[PDB]
Amino acid sequence: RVRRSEAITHGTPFQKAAALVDLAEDGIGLPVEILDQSSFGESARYYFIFTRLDLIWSLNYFALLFLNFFEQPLWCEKNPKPSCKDRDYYYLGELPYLTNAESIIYEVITLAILLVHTFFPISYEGSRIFWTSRLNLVKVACVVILFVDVLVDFLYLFLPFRIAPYVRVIIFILSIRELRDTLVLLSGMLGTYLNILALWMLFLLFASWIAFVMFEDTQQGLTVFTSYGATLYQMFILFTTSNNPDVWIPAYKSSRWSSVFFVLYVLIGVYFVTNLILAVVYDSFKEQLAKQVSGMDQMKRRMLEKAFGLIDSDKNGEIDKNQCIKLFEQLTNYRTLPKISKEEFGLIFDELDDTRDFKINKDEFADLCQAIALRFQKEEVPSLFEHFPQIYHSALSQQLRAFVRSPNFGYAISFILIINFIAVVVETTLDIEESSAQKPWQVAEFVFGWIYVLEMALKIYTYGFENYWREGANRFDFLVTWVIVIGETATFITPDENTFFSNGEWIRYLLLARMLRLIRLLMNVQRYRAFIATFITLIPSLMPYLGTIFCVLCIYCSIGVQVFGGLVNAGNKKLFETELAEDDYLLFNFNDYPNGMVTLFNLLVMGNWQVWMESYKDLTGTWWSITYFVSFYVITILLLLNLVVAFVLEAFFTELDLEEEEK
Amino acid sequence: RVRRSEAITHGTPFQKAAALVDLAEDGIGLPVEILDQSSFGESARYYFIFTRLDLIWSLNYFALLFLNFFEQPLWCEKNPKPSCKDRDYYYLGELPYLTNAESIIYEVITLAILLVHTFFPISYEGSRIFWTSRLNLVKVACVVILFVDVLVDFLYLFLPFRIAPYVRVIIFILSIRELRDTLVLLSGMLGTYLNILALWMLFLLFASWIAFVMFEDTQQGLTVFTSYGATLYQMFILFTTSNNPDVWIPAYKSSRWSSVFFVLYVLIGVYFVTNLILAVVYDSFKEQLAKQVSGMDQMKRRMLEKAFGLIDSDKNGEIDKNQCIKLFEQLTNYRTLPKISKEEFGLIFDELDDTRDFKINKDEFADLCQAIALRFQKEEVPSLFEHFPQIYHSALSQQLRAFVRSPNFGYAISFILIINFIAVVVETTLDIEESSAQKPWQVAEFVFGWIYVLEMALKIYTYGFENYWREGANRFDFLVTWVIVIGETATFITPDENTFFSNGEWIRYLLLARMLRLIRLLMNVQRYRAFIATFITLIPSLMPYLGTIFCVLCIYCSIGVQVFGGLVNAGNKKLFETELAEDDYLLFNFNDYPNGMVTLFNLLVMGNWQVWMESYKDLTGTWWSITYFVSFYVITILLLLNLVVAFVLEAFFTELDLEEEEK
């Protein structure tokens, strides 16, 4: 009945040892310097009061990252012949560009929060330890670069280019631990990836030389393979298989037999080389993941053994039975454990061995700690609202709590949400037929949303906020119901013809999200257990790699906006001759940052990706431009996406043999 | 110095046991019935005289399979408005269509060889055993269907469709042992694969319904998502991302926020669901592969213990030391083994154990036979040309044989291989510049061909044809050098302006194929050892799986020609409005069998694959036409191609841990 942070900062050595093994099994790792020092009181107090505010730091980081969307592009600052206010001319829009004053205010606020966050942990780590670490130094470098940029911007109201987006993306990377771990893995994998890249490039060069020398006099040689550079470029694009029949169709028209060579190339290029690259990336990722897991387990073992050293006041590596029973009492005060009688532990010791005054040493204590952690479930925090026990223990409150804890409440929720799904289907079907009876079904939809809000409040009351927040699905349901109630009150408060809220259709999608929980019932059937379990495990586990890919996209988008900022115009004569106009892709240009993000995503799926390369190569006039696009394929598609595939396979196998071991 | 087949058919029990263990280790498995019967003399003689002619049966099988290419399409037999001789009108050609008399002659010859092959093994297997097996019955059914078809064709010179092309493909599947094993794998894998398709199809139905209801009144709803049937058709194509920006661009023009839904669907559809399908197919393949390997090893164990039963005339499960040494002398005649002294094996027994008259039991004879097999390399067949020992052991011949066996000769070939490459690159570069001095380099390029024949005859002479043919690498060089001399003698004999041979540019591609042996030297360096060794092993190992895909193409090609035979015409008005004409894809139609194979390959790589579905749906006029293309994608792309990706990953890992093992 004692909070963990308070137990660490204040209490008897038994309390501190119990809370340390608590933090270990929860997975949270204290800084090493705090462990090294003696009794770590004030430093732990500061560290806890700091980590209590993690939400504010995360929101600041996300705001700083998403500033890039609203920031005005550089090429617009240089005088364009039409003003940028003519939004249709440059094929862009749908986001408001921040003016100078708004930008400076936003940057100043974010910079202040970032500064206080970055210079907070000097308090407990200490002057000497803080400055020695590389991470603190690189973060301070990023912060000072941002600050000097803000200052010179303020004084401004010449630069070839601006450096803020790259540095803020980098500091966002260094902000989150998972992204740092992902970068460590990538740095591990780079050498082997480079070796495979060298082999692949050699294969492309050889195949391109063969294809060039084969069709030297053929009409298809005049049409496309005009030079060695051109044929190498076409062979690379064909290796991506984005345009299979297009490249070699004049050869097929001239003579059918030539097709054999091409069906000989792609077959080798796709089924052999690409799969070998995938296997290599899989192996490297597996080794690096094993390395990371071993490191994490080593850190956990180290800080558990530090806790054992803490409880051992004699520091002679000796633990007695009385100390063991006191520690067991502390943990069973925290965690759920079978009740122990005073004579019972003595009887257990006596029947255990005939040795007298047996010493429990360090390593078996650690191992027994992991055993008791894995065998026994965690015990919920008592409450946050229990400051008034009389209301907490009221008869009606007790009856309600007993009812909601019973599975009958879950069955009722399932029935309610199934009826909700039926109502949503009926309303949508009526909408399709343009019936005039939509309103009763829509108000039924709203009252269903109100029911969801009510049940969320009931559950968060009965379980307690921390225990409610602990479960993953509860967080998703919490966000969904909160956005539902916010939207509903926004619609109700204003009885006017709003653009979005007045329609009232939006609510259905939220309820559909609220009913994604249906898919969880499919874990019941044996056939689909592995698929659903692996998918649900994958989502939060695969968030960090997707975030790394997203940040790489952000960096490439900044580079592309900087380089190709103003090339696409309504009045550009060379543009209409390019393939973008023919396929009507003008809305996917690089004129502003959000458009850059969407076009980079389109390049990511490898769907008609060569049209952008060819069009921008014609538009800029230099072959070097393709470098950019080529780089995006080499770094992202060959490496990161193959890493994601490897992770999905590994997660599926882990779920599978876990299910087998369950039997 | 006794041939293995002769040893089995005639000889003492020691000879038969040695030859049986040799066959078991070599991997060749005798029929079970021959093992069951006593002493299996005449049956083994017939089986050997049969299996001696495996090349003829294989060539007959391949000729029967490739008959389909030259066979006239059915739709041409129906009277067309313009004659089929107008080859340009129907967008087809480049192969000669086999006339009636030629077709009947070819079919009769192939049928005769097939019939004698299929009815040969009744001789040794016996009447009751042969007819009971399912495989013999299905083969006989295929044969009788083919024969009755040939007979009714002969009598003809009404039918809605012809059944021959499907049958001769099936009889090709179960003629080859490797292709039979692959189908057994797919039968096991189909049960698990069907479960996932239910979830994948369910995900498509749900996602399509959301997209349909979201964009009901949107301008993008009018253009593409006009109905639920249409939106399900578009979302399915988007799942493969073959047309990513095309489908949802009217929505992006209306409101940029619409991209978020299409980004979400593609992200979850491609990165999560598609990879999970690969994980499921990988597992099912891995489990079934162990089922096949364990079954194969069980068959090897059974025949090995049969050899022990054969030598054990007492049939009491007893083997004595004096009996063991006689058998050991037989294997050391077949396999290389250290020389054993007569007194030595007596010393071996006493030091081994103090037991007297120790019995070597049935089981420990088996595992010991593998122990000798893996540690000791195979001993080559003495020779086939050694019928004249005086020439074989002549003074000059022995000196020559010593030189070629020595590694010094091997270096010279590699040195010659390099000098050839410089001659080729110099000769080709002159052609690029249209130099008039190409001929002097071209004739010097021929003489490198005669060297390659000279060393081929030199190598086959010292090793012997059976020992020469044993190595996989030697087989590749043997085929390459033979087409060189066959091609070269064609140009020399005819001093005329031939279409292909007179140019002389053909030899460089054969020479480039000959020096592919150089890439094997990259196995020396540690960085590329894993990549190259896996790739080389993949070429023979992946043939049965690639062969299975090719045969699936032959079945769809026959179906496509039957259904879509005459739809593509020069005079067809609806065709020019379709997407095929806009992209100029008319040469990839389904008019005849050779064209069908190429266009099916284009669907295999998933490159602009939707143009064929959409065009033929308009051309035929029924929505049932998409069934042919959707079924092809589901069976081939999702299952077969993922199986190949599963195999390449599996083959690579067994290569890495192999390399670790020698260390």
Ligand SMILES: [Ca+2]
């Ligand atoms: Ca002590």
Ligand SMILES: [Ca+2]
């Ligand atoms: Ca509507």
Ligand SMILES: [Ca+2]
């Ligand atoms: Ca015996």
Ligand SMILES: [Ca+2]
């Ligand atoms: Ca030429």
